[PDB]
Amino acid sequence: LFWDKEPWFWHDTLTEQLWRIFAGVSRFLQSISWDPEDFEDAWKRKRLAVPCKLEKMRILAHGELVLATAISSFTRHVFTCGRRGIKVWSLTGQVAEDRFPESHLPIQTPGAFLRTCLLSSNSRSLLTGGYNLASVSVWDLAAPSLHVKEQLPCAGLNCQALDANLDANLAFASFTSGVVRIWDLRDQSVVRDLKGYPDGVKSIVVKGYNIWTGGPDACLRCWDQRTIMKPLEYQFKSQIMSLSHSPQEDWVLLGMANGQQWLQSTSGSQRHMVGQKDSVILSVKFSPFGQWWASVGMDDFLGVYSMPAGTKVFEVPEMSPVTCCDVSSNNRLVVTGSGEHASVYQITY
Amino acid sequence: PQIRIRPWWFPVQELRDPLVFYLEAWLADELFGPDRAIIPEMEWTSQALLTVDIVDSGNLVEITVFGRPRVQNRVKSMLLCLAWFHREHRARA
Amino acid sequence: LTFSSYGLQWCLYELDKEEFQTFKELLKKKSSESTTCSIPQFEIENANVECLALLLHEYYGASLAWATSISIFENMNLRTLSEKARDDMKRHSPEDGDTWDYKSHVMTKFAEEEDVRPEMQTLAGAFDSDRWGFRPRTVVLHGKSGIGKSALARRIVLCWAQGGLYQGMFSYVFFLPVREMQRKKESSVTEFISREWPDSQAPVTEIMSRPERLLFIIDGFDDLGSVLNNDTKLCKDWAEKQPPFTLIRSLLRKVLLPESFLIVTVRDVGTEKLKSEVVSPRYLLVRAVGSLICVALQLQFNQTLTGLHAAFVFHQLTPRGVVRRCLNLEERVVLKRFCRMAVEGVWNRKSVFDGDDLMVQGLGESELRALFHMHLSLQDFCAALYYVLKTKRSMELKQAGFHIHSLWMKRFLFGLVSEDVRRPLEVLLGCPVPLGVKQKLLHWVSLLGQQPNATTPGDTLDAFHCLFETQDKEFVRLALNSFQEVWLPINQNLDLIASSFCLQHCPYLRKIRVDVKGIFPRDESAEACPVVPLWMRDKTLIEEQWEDFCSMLGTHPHLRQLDLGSSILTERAMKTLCAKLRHPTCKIQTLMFRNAQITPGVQHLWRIVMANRNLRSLNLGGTHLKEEDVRMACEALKHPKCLLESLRLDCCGLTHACYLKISQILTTSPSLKSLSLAGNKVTDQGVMPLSDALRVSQCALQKLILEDCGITATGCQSLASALVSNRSLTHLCLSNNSLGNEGVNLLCRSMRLPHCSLQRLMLNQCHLDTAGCGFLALALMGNSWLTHLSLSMNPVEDNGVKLLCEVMREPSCHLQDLELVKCHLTAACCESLSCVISRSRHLKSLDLTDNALGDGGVAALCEGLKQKNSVLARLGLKACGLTSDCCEALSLALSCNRHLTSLNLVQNNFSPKGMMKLCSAFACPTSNLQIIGLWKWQYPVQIRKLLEEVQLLKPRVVIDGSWHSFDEDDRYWWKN
The missing domain is CATH 1.10.533.10 (Death Domain, Fas)
Known part of the structure; x- marks a missing residue:
């Protein structure tokens, strides 16, 4: 696309020639693939292999700054978020750059923004929230027509982080008043309220009965839902930007906003640096199978790292700062967001 | 002219090149039920759209599948296997 | 259930x-x-x-x-x-007065102007709620172009006028035609509501009184989009006058009159343009190709559809009442203008032609109606027939290039180069036509051919479809001259017909793979289909055409390799395939069946080995072999006419008696020079018969692979005794087996003798250590036959590598290729290796991957490679934690050294200055590196152009990130 001098397809040249005739006046980019049999990556000489290659294959134009992204591979669509609304794209067609979304969901209300979004693991619902809005809404995607099905109330609150757990039917959210609220999707009723810290918590991670939260105060805390026990605090030297949780093994990945990554274990207080940069990490995302992770930073770079020690397999440069990334469940596609655009790469290994 | 609802997630492009095969009327009756209330769930899980119709004589049922050709072949094989199970079950009793 | x-x-x-x-x-x-x-x-x-x-x-x-x-x-x-x-x-799992007059007048109006020029239940339920629970305000209809959306909307307004449809919901119906909206530059909803009524005066308060009472019908949204493409601010006020496209946009965005409910009729391209506008709609699908086809059959070129369409159109173009009359100049001019207007319609994506444009073109209406009988298919056909006979860059180019509806035009254009359809055109017009579109199509297909990668499966299938449409042998040959190997998935019967016709005409085809799933006929038993007759269930045309495909696969003279990427074979399918492959005229050498599922048809496989003289290699993998199968395989191998030189068995799960029979044929079969048993369970009770077979002097086995066999030290000593006995075996692989230092010692003792005649030995994941490395070092001194040694993924430490280096520095050692990976090395190891490289002479290759050598180790290796005596050919570095200083030193070394050819540097962290130094060293004429390992796109644009400059200088160099590029095939081909 942008990196190449000019992206062309195989029928595009014949179309150009026929247009020239009418008007009287490798080399070919490929489309993305879904079938495992056509993936055909040669054996090295479901799978825990570390990737080895990247190639950009589409560009999405949103018309304004991009705040958050999400990608589904069971259903091919992609979701982009901005301060005015949410746009749904489709990855089934073939084109270098697309301007025509599959749908647009606008939010019109005096002084109503958006900041966050979240897609459920089964691909059947989507959570939305922002500033000065009445409540956090959920959308039903399995229906023959998109529509809101529930409304999770919050009065005079400005949310900044969302998370959802589907096995127990819970929903989580954090607000700028240092309050974390829990809701039940069966009753849409508030369950339990966590409070006591003024700065708030920028990122939240939920697995099992543990809630991990960290923010500019340079501390990480663990809350338990079963009891009302006080959280356990681990002190660091810099402010946390993002968090993620290793699915297979007990390891919490966190970025320190001074270009330093760490791993922390729930069972014991062990730490060890796994990477260092001169930038500020704005996001860390973790692969579904747990063997690698992606990191996007302020100094215009997308990097892929290796779990055992943190060695970086490779990286890609970009013109404008990136602020969000997301990895598919097939472990083959990854989507980042910079400027007013979102780009789609493919993973081959 | 026949008018059918289509979901928002099924792209218009895939509507091209449908697949057609016939089965018995009663056999389709136990497969789908007299109400056909399971078709939306099957469509969502398979990401493909089906359609069941009955000939005026009431002997044959025409089934059409929308989607990529491998998906159509897979769904056809699955339905044929279930049809054989029901036929042999009827033969047993 | x-x-x-x-x-x-x-x-x-x-x-x-x-x-x-x-x-x-x-x-x-x-x-x-x-x-x-x-x-x-x-x-x-x-x-x-x-x-x-x-x-x-x-x-x-x-x-x-x-x-x-x-x-x-x-x-x-x-x-x-x-x-x-x-x-x-x-x-x-289941759970456990005035309005009446207005509507009558509307009825009369559209009754009159429809005289001028079932589904009702669905249209009545259009506004009902579904089982989810939802009430839609907007309903969008799309479908095929044969039906009249205008007729449907007008019948809806009719049924409302009588009141049998939607009687209780709403009180008003406004019918909006879009062309008439375009007729007037300035328009507002006030003017329209005044227009529709007879008296032309309406109570605006009554109109704006309630939301539910109003319903709008918008028709033909696709027919006009150019004006709508312009972006203007939406109008909140209804009464204000604005351009009509702005009103339509505001109405669809639901900003204007947000409370009322809509309904829109559109086409496929229209809905592609429209889906971004509407909010939360309900899409309905409505579904004259069949009538057109049957009429064309009536007025009959059976091979292809383009022949049928050409027959129809050329019959129509004949003068009425006259046969084969030459067209006059005016008729040719009007035909050309007709075709030009058709191509303008295709490019602009509009199938409805207005009177004013037809006036601009200048063709008469009666002559036009004489030229056309009915469709989009005929529009595409006439566009192609135009190609047989504005703005520099336009949106219409990218629109019509989307090739959902341009595909038919392209297919007809390909089908028009055939001579059988060209001659009726020649006799009809009476003049000969030269055309260069044939040359353009030929160049296009060839340009597909010359791509360096193996042809993409979908591209290959599309190209075969087009060339099958063409139907010219020489044209097909010139088109497919470029490429040698193909990749051909098959999903339908027509794919079997097209591939069967088109692949006989590839003159230089050498390799092919096929992916065949679902095509085989429903099993004759247990899967009967009421629609499919006995001919369709059994002895189907699919069976005969599969037979034809197999025949043409067998008879091809230049084909050497036959592959099956992934397939699901029925036993009849393998019976037919093997029957076709038995006949001696076949010339295929290498067969590969590792990923295919072929279990029911294995019993037919051995006859081709028995009979076909030219077959050399055979591969099976992941299949289950019965004892009768192995007995038949041994019996076939024992036949003297066999010349099969390679047999590979993987994960087959053989029995002890199977190993007995394998040993018997190993003693018996003269031709078999290779054998692989990788992943199979191989007990020591199976290892002993192999040793007994190898002890005999008649054995001629040169290679032997045992991977994941789980052998023990007793197997080691049995193999050691066999090696003492034997002199034929040369290559041996024992990897991922827990041999231990004891097995290493046994093999060391047996290799210590000067009579050992093996050249290559590999032992990975064998749980070696310093002691085993010392044993190997002791065995290595005084031995000359062994040339290659590989010890990877074993914690052979610094002291072990030092022992190996001390042994190998001696002049009498003749070790050439030694590669070691994941052996926990350090800098002092690298210094010793540098001394060895500078001093020794026979060492040609080396490898150090996944080791933390650091900067000091690479500096020591640099100092070693600086010497002119060194003759090291290829060096492999990766994930060694390199930085700026070490890369500067390496740059100076490559500046000074000459003999080094290949190199690799991936997963290392290089600053821009260091890569500047590396490029400067690379470009120097003193250094001649022919293969380099680096990823180009990982670096900034300045570094990318600098590497492009370094590439344009010295055009021999090849920069590719994936190393092992253009490497010798033997090294990886032996292992597996």
């Missing part, structure tokens, strides 16, 4: 073939241990995915089978598929 098994089958389709075998064996163990419910073993083995899930529900029951499958999935270490199965279980 079915609603619960369907989900389980859809979950089990995710598992791989080896995963499927693991699932089957775990299910076997669970069934055998349990006594409450019994599952037969052969019934489990014979079952595929669908039969497995169906049987599991049939025996266990629904919830029990779902729970068992989830448990096995969690056992196999799969945790995402388990969650998906749990959710699918949660869902699939």
